Design a protein around this nucleic acid. Sequence first.
RNA 1: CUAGACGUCUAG
RNA 2: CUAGACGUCUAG
Lengths: 122, 122, 122, 122
Amino acid sequence: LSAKDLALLLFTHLPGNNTPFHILAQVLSKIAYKSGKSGAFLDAFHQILSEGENAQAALTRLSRTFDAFLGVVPPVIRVKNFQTVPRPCQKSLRAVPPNPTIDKGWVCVYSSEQGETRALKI
Amino acid sequence: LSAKDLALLLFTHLPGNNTPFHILAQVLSKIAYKSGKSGAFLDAFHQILSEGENAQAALTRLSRTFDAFLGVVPPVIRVKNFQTVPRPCQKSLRAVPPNPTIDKGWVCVYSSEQGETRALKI
Amino acid sequence: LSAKDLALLLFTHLPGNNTPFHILAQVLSKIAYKSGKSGAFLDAFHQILSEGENAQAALTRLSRTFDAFLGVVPPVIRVKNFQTVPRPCQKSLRAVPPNPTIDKGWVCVYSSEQGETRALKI
Amino acid sequence: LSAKDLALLLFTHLPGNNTPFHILAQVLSKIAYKSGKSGAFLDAFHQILSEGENAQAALTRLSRTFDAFLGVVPPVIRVKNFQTVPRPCQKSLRAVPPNPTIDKGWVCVYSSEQGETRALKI
RNA sequence: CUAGACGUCUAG
RNA sequence: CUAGACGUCUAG
């Protein structure tokens, strides 16, 4: 199952659109796919849901416990400006810390044309 | 007190029409009735109200604490499509998780004519 | 300042006519006057406005914090039927809870000729 | 770019005539110009539009976030009477609060020939 | 203390 | 479309 199809599937479990969790779904999906852990990642995700957790709690937990995400630095996404970042994510932008990693809640790093950077934090 | 009468009574405490809480009222009433807990349920509902809680917070609380609802899987409701579902509920629809239970906020499972399913989440 | 004059003054700060907030202005003015807290009530109301809050936010806040309103049960108002209640208030009518008090958002209790009761809720 | 030209430019983005937002455009422009922020103001206005916001949402937002408007008291406008105020604005008139500021939605203060005052609220 | 997703109403 | 009041769920 491709990263795209994987991300879309996780989307069906999330409320709203273009939320920090949506971005996290895309990021975790891609990292999982490229690691060949696409199937295992999906299984773990559903396992958590069965425990009584919701999609959001599952993604945050997986980002902290799924070995494939441990120590992995958030991906850098280029954007005209920070106002280009999905609206529901804007208020979650922080200055980038020295060593950003996904297991620490850092979803991605936005880079503006002006060279400025902001990290999406959950 | 029948399920219908019980639901209609809860409706008088709820704002608007056909809200997720309206659906929850019906589900909870129906389950309570066939459990023989129709009376206890209503009493508990009034007790919570007397504590200062509103109707909405009372229903969600009951769904989480009332023993007759614990572990109970949400009922399946047939609909032509997901646009047939009451307006006020549509944006609260999500993919059905592995083990949906009412005590976890899952009101009901809608099934469409093409075998698709969406779960009402509060 | 009389309850009437007091209510009329608050009216000038409220948008529209015969809204739930208009009814609240009357109820709070009446209770305040009878308590001899007419002056204090008006002062607190303006103190809040100066904070940047609007009239509506001020009234709901006072109803929750102004000691003179704490634990006070909403006044019962007689009306032919619930259709007699001001239009703008009709959709805010709920069944009366066990222990209605103003500090809980309950403005007043409407009693119809048929003995039915509805509570105005903000 | 003078205050007049600036206001006329904002007008081209606004629906109808003599609406509360038209008055806001004039006030905000006049204040911006005198602050030497005429240019910055226009740029910010266009920036917001490019984000998907309409002219109306842009003005209200600027009035809340543009530093040149923070803490500024609405200007006083003389009128024969409150029926002389643009029709589209009349129903938005309210009693002047203790400390009216533009960043709180207060556009302007109208004063009549009888020494009476009303504030335009958005 | 942040933030996200809903629901109800009111005024223009 | 804009402004406001009330409430429900959730994540850090």
